[PDB]
Amino acid sequence: VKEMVRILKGIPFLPLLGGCIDDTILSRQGFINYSKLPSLALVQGELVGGLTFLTAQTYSMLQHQPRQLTALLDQYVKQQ
């Protein structure tokens, strides 16, 4: 609908009442939100990122403890 709403918004007097997309009824605002929404490949590709984010966040936080000392050591060099 990204290329469909653009045509609709090019003429200010052609209302978009609603409709059903894949057995799901939407309003005009739902269509607008659906338009700004990414595709299946992008959304599913980011789905695995969020599910594995919990493990990734745990590893980053555990590895952050040695990095805290390095940042403080680098900060001291920045001071002097």
Binding site: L54, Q57, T58, M61, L62, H64
Partner: peptide, 27 residues
């Protein structure tokens, strides 16, 4: 070391998520 990995692997999502939150509060 290995026992800790097994214990962490034996927890659910909510317990692990709350475990990370406490680590964020501590470190």
């Amino acid at each position: 070391i290995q026992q800790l990995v097994q214990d962490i692997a034996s927890l659910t999502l909510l317990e692990i998520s709350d475990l990370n939150e406490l680590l964020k509060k501590t470190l």
